[PDB]
Amino acid sequence: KSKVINSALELGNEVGIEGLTTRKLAQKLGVEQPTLYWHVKNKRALLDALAVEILARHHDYSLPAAGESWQSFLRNNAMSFRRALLRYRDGAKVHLGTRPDEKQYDTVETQLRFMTENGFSLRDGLYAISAVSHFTLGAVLEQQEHTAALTDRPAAPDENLPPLLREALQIMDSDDGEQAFLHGLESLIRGFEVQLTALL
Amino acid sequence: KSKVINSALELGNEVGIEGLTTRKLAQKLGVEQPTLYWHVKNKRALLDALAVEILARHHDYSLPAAGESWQSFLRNNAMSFRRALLRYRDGAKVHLGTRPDEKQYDTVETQLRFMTENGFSLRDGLYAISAVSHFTLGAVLEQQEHTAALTDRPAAPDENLPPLLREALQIMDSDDGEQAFLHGLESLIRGFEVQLTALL
Ligand SMILES: Cc1c2c(c(O)c3c(O)cccc13)C(=O)[C@]1(O)C(=O)C(C(N)=O)=C(O)[C@@H](N(C)C)[C@@H]1C2
Ligand SMILES: Cc1c2c(c(O)c3c(O)cccc13)C(=O)[C@]1(O)C(=O)C(C(N)=O)=C(O)[C@@H](N(C)C)[C@@H]1C2
Numbered sequence: 329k330s331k332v333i334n335s336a337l338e339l340g341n342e343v344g345i346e347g348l349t350t351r352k353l354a355q356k357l358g359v360e361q362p363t364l365y366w367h368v369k370n371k372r373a374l375l376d377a378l379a380v381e382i383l384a385r386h387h388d389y390s391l392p393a394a395g396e397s398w399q400s401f402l403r404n405n406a407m408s409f410r411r412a413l414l415r416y417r418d419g420a421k422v423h424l425g426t427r428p429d430e431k432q433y434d435t436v437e438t439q440l441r442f443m444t445e446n447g448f449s450l451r452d453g454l455y456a457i458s459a460v461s462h463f464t465l466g467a468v469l470e471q472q473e474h475t476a477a478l479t480d481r482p483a484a485p486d487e488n489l490p491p492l493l494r495e496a497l498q499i500m501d502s503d504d505g506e507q508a509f510l511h512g513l514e515s516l517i518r519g520f521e522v523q524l525t526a527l528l
Numbered sequence: 529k530s531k532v533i534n535s536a537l538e539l540g541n542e543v544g545i546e547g548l549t550t551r552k553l554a555q556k557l558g559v560e561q562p563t564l565y566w567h568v569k570n571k572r573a574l575l576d577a578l579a580v581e582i583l584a585r586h587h588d589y590s591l592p593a594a595g596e597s598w599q600s601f602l603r604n605n606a607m608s609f610r611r612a613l614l615r616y617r618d619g620a621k622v623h624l625g626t627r628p629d630e631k632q633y634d635t636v637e638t639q640l641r642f643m644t645e646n647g648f649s650l651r652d653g654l655y656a657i658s659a660v661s662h663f664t665l666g667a668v669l670e671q672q673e674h675t676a677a678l679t680d681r682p683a684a685p686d687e688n689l690p691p692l693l694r695e696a697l698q699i700m701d702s703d704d705g706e707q708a709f710l711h712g713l714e715s716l717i718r719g720f721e722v723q724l725t726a727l728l
């Protein structure tokens with residue numbers, strides 16, 4: 329199962345999530361398709377394993393530092409999650425709809441516990457963490473897909489742009505989406521603060 | 529171009545975004561593939577058109593009501609966007625990375641103008657709108673992909689779950705993701721309020 333992930337990751341960056349086929353993986357592994365099907369129950373199982381391995385390799389801020397604020401942790405954790413998702417073609421797509429793996433239980437429990445220790449209810453701490461995750465996934469996928477489309481997509485017409493949209497597009501072309509992402513992350517954290525403060 | 533979208537939408541729900549192929553669309557249209565290629569420059573152009581049409585058909589809260597607060601508008605707009613994305617298989621996937629179409633310019637300009645009239649800078653109003661969009665896309669895609677995986681994905685092991693994760697999973701299995709979504713939306717709006725308030 330170790331080398332299979334490594335080959336599948338290499339294949340996935342070369343052909344994308346859609347092109348990560350049984351035929352093509354079995355070819356890369358040097359084996360008959362029936363053998364690949366035997367040990368890897370299906371594509372969804374493979375994708376699940378890739379989602380875990382991508383965070384294992386590249387998500388380096390999964391735990392709070394000693395004495396770190398929850399605000400700081402959420403920000404650093406989100407930036408790390410983003411960096412991990414961006415490392416591979418369709419990395420964010422691979423993650424979508426997964427649930428924590430057994431190897432991640434201690435990590436995600438620590439995050440949940442950290443929120444409750446800071447005074448969030450489990451439900452609200454979960455919803456905050458979920459909001460950060462969903463926002464980050466959406467921001468990453470929009471960025472990755474926009475970049476991927478540049479080749480196929482006609483230069484969009486500017487002769488009839490209204491003023492604010494015209495300015496907005498200029499702002500968005502000024503970087504890769506990172507500024508927007510950091511601003512949204514801060515909006516979320518400011519929101520969680522308001523909410524937490526009221527309840528306590 | 530009208531009937532093509534209609535057939536492609538019907539095909540897309542039956543075979544997904546990946547299965548929306550030239551071969552298969554040309555077959556559904558009753559035409560040779562070279563004819564389909566002629567008028568539809570490529571798949572990305574088709575997907576772009578589908579993204580516009582899906583909102584045209586089902587996104588019914590694109591404009592603020594007379595006298596409506598920006599907080600209320602963002603919430604109602606987000607709920608509507610979600611409802612539209614959820615209507616079709618891979619609707620959220622179709623949207624990813626698109627930019628406003630000429631037919632949408634007046635609509636998105638109105639939204640941007642509404643934020644600036646309420647005291648947001650154009651940049652901050654844009655980043656707020658972008659945050660709502662990214663969060664909604666991420667929440668929808670996670671929900672849709674989780675549901676789609678239920679068939680292929682083994683019943684995940686519960687014998688070694690830690691307490692907070694165990695409770696979190698029970699909370700998440702209690703609905704389809706809507707409660708989490710509404711909570712995250714409120715966190716975002718509370719955050720934007722804090723930010724706007726400080727600046728003014
Ligand atoms: C707590 C939790 C998390 C995630 C998650 O999917 C999830 C779930 O599906 C059900 C119940 C709880 C969770 C994350 O994916 C994950 O990305 C993650 O696995 C994770 C991780 N493994 O380190 C994180 O850093 C978290 N962060 C991005 C908010 C978040 C934590
Ligand atoms: C303003 C804006 C929007 C969107 C968008 O993609 C975008 C962009 O890519 C660049 C610059 C501005 C925008 C939306 O997709 C869209 O979904 C949308 O098209 C849209 C719409 N057409 O009605 C919306 O309702 C908006 N809402 C979900 C926040 C948002 C507005």
Ligand SMILES: [Mg+2]
Nearest residue numbers: 344345418476
């Ligand atoms: Mg792709």
Ligand SMILES: [Mg+2]
Nearest residue numbers: 426427428461
């Ligand atoms: Mg996850």
Ligand SMILES: [Mg+2]
Nearest residue numbers: 544545618676
């Ligand atoms: Mg699918």
Ligand SMILES: [Mg+2]
Nearest residue numbers: 626627628661
């Ligand atoms: Mg958009």
